Design a protein around this nucleic acid. Structure first.
Lengths: 51, 78, 102
RNA sequence: UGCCUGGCGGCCGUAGCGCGGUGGUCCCACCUGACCCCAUGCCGAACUCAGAAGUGAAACGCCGUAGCGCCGAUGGUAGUGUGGGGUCUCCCCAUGCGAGAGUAGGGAACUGCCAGGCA
RNA sequence: GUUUAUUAAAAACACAGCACUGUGCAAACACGAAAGUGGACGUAUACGGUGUGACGCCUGCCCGGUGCCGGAAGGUUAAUUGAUGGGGUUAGCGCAAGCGAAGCUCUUGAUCGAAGCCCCGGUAAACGGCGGCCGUAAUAACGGUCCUAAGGUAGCGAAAUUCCUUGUCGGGUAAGUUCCGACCUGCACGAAUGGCGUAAUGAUGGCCAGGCUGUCUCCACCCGAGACUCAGUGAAAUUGAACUCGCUGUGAAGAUGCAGUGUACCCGCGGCAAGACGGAAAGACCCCGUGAACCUUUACUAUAGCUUGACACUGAACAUAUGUUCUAACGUUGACCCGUAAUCCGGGUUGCGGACAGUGUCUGGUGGGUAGUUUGACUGGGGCGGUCUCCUCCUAAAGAGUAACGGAGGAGCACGAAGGUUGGCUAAUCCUGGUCGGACAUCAGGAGGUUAGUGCAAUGGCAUAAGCCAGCUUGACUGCGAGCGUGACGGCGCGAGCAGGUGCGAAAGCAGGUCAUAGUGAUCCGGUGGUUCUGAAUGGAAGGGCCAUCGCUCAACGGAUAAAAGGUACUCCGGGGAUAACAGGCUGAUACCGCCCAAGAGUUCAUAUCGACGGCGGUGUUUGGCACCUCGAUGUCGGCUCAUCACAUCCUGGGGCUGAAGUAGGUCCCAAGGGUAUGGCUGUUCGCCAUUUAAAGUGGUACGCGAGCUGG
RNA sequence: AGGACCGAACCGACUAAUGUUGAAAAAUUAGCGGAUGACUUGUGGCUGGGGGUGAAAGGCCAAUCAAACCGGGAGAUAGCUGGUUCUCCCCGAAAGCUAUUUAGGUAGCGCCUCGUGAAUUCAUCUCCGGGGGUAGAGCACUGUUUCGGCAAGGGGGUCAUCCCGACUUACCAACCCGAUGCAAACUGCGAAUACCGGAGAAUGUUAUCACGGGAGACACACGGCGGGUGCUAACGUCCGUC
RNA sequence: UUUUGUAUAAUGGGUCAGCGACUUAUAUUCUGUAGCAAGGUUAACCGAAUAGGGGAGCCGAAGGGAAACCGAGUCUUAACU
RNA sequence: CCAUAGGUUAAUGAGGCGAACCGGGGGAACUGAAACAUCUAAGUACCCCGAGGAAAAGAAAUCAACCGAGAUUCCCCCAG
RNA sequence: GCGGGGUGGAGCAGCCGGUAGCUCGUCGGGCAACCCGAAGGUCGUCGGUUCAAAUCCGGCCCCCGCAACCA
């Protein structure tokens, strides 16, 4: 629906990413979260990016 | 001659898959149900969809316990 | 999907004439002008398009972009028709000429 | 060993409400103070700490009492599996199972572990 | 005048006349890959196309849609040209990572680019259109008002047009659904898909009268050819086999063949056709086929033709890509000479056009002119309507599952908190008291105990809360998965536990999304990031692979194609009584006819005669239900002829009661022996009307009767 | 003079009857239209199939025309109809679920058959361990319904008179209480059956499960029982079990 | 024959005789049988050769993975109890 | 005007038929896809031209893979 | 038989869960034209859901576009 799919890009520089959804209208702020990254093996902070 | 009805959902095969006194391997689903009609007791886990599964081999057993007189499922170890 | 607007409908919304029938009669009589020339009622008003309208004794020329099918209160009509500065000056010139005639 | 009190349970209304009475040595409760450990989307009400002046008022426990809740026969009734039948939208018969409601009645719980005060 | 040779001769076609439009001649248009030919050995007073159809009076308003004509101010836009950017490769530089010149090469595509389209005007004897609503003199003149491009002028009008309809009134007739004349309430006339008249003409349609008559009441007789008999010759369709009766019932439901019963010696000949669902034609109507044909169009996809531009055939100067001039390519369906005995053809001279025209390749537009195709399924026949996937409840018969065009509601999401954890808290409703404040605001207490709440339908859950509040946080983690549920399969679902790492908690522990169940899309084809896994001689790269991930209202939701609407009565083929229309069959809701109780009408009295509010039956008679027989055939309405049966009786016959004085009635009971109209209108059954009669019965018999007649 | 008039030859075909296995695959008889013209006719030529011609009917094109005839692709295709030929022995269905441009076809499963392997694998009965929320029953709940008691409050308005205390109703009355019903989408109760599991004896030609070869079938009908729809109508239609 | 069901008044046959419908080629799986047996077997072709030669080939003995690669193991994952 | 075209004669060859095979110039639809357009049927049927007893092809501007083969055609595998 | 509508005196958005407004008609005031202010609905009627219906659902009445066709 209104929610648009986005990618959370690992900040480890390894190119791994997650996919989630959000709506731009209510929450224009960037999405940032600590998620596990398999290739580097460590909990690193992910920032959203365009899909 | 138009009717607004005629719509239904596929049945979900709920109910008690394993009844009392039946030997079940670990992890076997005992009852699938909507809501915790049967509650989790000894050696029984409650999955997210309120299904109850045996956490160890043994014999399933229904009983009534507690101030609410609710049904509880437990695996008598064997 | 833009909704087309008739010329007499626009005039009636702008309240220049009491009724759309009067607007049609005035247009058919040739008094009303679109882009400074005789125009039929079927013509379409467009944004940033001059309406060389002739009402009573004073001319008006508006190029408004806001076109409303619905008739509005006169406070809104002031916004409905733009009445550019040159048109204002010409209208006051016509008013002064009428005052001199009177 | 007997009485009473606190905690943890078994069981989940025969065990719960109501009404009356009773208890402070110990235990519990209320209670005194709170700058501080701690907390109020305000309040030491709750939570929390520091104590033991007073009391059993409230709560709590214990005893009694059917105004309720609750439990509940025997008999009949309803229903129904199998077979047979009728006047076949419903019944009946043999045999097996046999309710629900209602009636007589029961009923003011019983009980395990540990700790404490009294004899 | 012409026409469906062989069911349609006409209101149809044509017609002279009228108008619009194209065409300047190498005309337009047509046949033709082209050369050529018709147009025409014609030249706008001619030829082509289109519409109306002599003649008389006229042809009103509308240019928004579609088409046609015209325009340039602007935007979009093909082929072609290839600036800039990115990438691949490597002579080199670095120690390695990596950087990287030239060349070659993959890719994006700046600038140039005509028509068309968007846009602006004109055109209706171009295709076309000429509307709503409200009030107003019972109607609604008239006005108001919405919309449109603008709302029907003249004329005509229940008509070849009018459903209600046999419209209202008058003539004709005794009686006139037709006819003739007026009215206007034109469902739904209307001016060249022409309106209104009109003399004449019509194997034209409707009606009326004189005369005429076997059309008819009602048939009679006669003359001839068959039919019948004798002699000679000598077919046909059809045919499972027949020792080939009626009735009532039964039965794939309309029986010569079954059950019961009645009748019947065997066999011809002449006649009538009720039956053998009789013979003829694998139903023409209806449905089905992922059948066919031909036709239509703003269905899809192409394409002939028309049309635009680039390049080529294709050149030169001069002036400012445009213009002027030129001759040498090219054209000449101009003249003249020759091959030549020649209106073809070729060559030469000359003239006129002249780098235009025309043709080839490429390219945009237009393109039912032509071609291949599509145009779903369920369906108490088909069509129209509705539905097509997912979730909740009931039907669902106490495991699961379970259909209907059965009964009821929702979904195609939401959320970085509405998730995780830790700690804490408990609702609705009512009563009492309290400022505005009241029925319902917040405050206090009491009763009550989940009747509240759940992000969204319903069900099942929920106090240990899954409900409400706060602090910290990202477990809405990565890889696996013992076992199990559910599906034909694809798949969908639940899951303790293990490893790495994290959040909350002092710890025990919980966390792999949310109280659960809906919030979805296979495969293919591609896109993006990572990973040498592969790398068509080798080294790289392109592509492919693995992992993550993006693009379908593919909603006909297991999705046929990237891409698709209709007509057929001009029809056709394979099939079905698997499925409709007539008839039969089953049922009897409705229809008709009886009966029950008795409020009331009947001056009083319920029942002489009616009988409300309700109830119970009979027949199979109308309207309907089912689809059981027949679709390798069961002919349908009405009339004519001929009838047969039932009795729920129209007349005649007998009788009870009466609100029966008599006559004449009302009702009911018994009775089926006999009887039971002629006409006008209309296709009529029916029905209205006129005139009779004792009466002009109600029904069944394939709504009797077409191998008996007709055919409105 | 006349696309003039009446009317034979000649051309045509309006009405009726006959004929309809004819005299005739479109005629005969009696009537009928044109008959100096857009007439009719003899002989020869041209137009050839998505083509011709057509005073226009989809008419004609060799008795055939919404695309002729002949030969070929060709044995087109046909989820459709029909037919499928000797004998005996053993076994023996289905007309159901799922999906389908799918509904009269086909595919997987279900059912049948042949072979291989396998456990007391399977069926009945007795006993034992189970959950249920249907028949029935009930009205605490969700709804619905009748009567009565008190009566918050209100309606016609007022004694009181600011009120309280209550005054009769044209009166209406919420909740609560007492009594009586009703429910597929009500349930504080709740069977008989059926179903799952366990143990045991008897009987049964392994009757059960798995793998493989071969299918057929996916149009069902009636009757009993429980039901929806229908009218508790149908030899009606759609389910469950026998 | 088609059907839920036909004495059916549903379909076909007037009768007799003759003809008339699951075949043929190749390739794959299964069953039976026969040869050989961790081996089996040739095709074309040579050959007068139903012989003999011809062993080019196909099948399985080794699987896992997309693949490099590894191999009684492999793949998944950094690694698996 | 030379000349060319043109005309007459002469010598040589051709012309037409024939079953299949061969080469070349053109070239369908039915059909399968369970519809149909990309595709298939299929460069098949058919039409035309040409030649021979055979025709076509034919002596690497071919393959291969850092080792090598040595024109063309046909048969069997590679291989569904 | 299927869908739409039913809102001041008329025409109208809205509206479609969140306290009813605009033009004309009437009056009055500014000033034929034009500007300002005010009365003016109770949302066709009856019920249900909701904290609350102009709004959302069930039935009822009227009017509108359709179809009631092949035999």
């Amino acid at each position: 629906g209104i929610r648009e799919k986005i990618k959370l890009v690992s900040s480890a520089g390894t190119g791994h990413f997650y996919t989630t959804t959000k709506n731009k209208r209510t929450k224009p702020e960037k999405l940032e979260l600590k998620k596990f990254d398999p290739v580097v093996r460590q909990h690193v902070i992910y920032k959203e990016a365009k899909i | 001659g138009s009717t607004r009805n005629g719509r239904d959902s596929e049945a979900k095969r709920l109910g008690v898959k394993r009844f009392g006194g039946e030997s079940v391997l670990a992890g076997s689903i005992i009852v699938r149900q909507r809501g915790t009609k049967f509650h989790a007791g000894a050696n029984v886990g409650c999955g997210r969809d309120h299904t109850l599964f045996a956490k160890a081999d043994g014999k399933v057993k229904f009983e009534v316990k507690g101030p609410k007189n609710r049904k509880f499922i437990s695996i008598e170890a064997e | 999907p833009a909704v087309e607007v008739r010329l007499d409908k626009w005039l009636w919304a702008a309240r220049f004439y009491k009724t759309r029938a009067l607007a049609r009669e005035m247009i058919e009589g040739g008094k009303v002008h679109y882009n400074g020339q005789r125009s039929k009622p079927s013509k379409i008003v467009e944004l940033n398009a001059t309406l060389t309208l002739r009402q009573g004794n004073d001319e008006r020329t508006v190029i408004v972009k806001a076109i409303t099918e619905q008739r509005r209160p006169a406070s809104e009509a002031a916004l409905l028709y733009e009445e550019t500065a040159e048109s204002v000056e010409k209208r006051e010139k016509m008013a002064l000429a009428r005052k001199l005639n009177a």
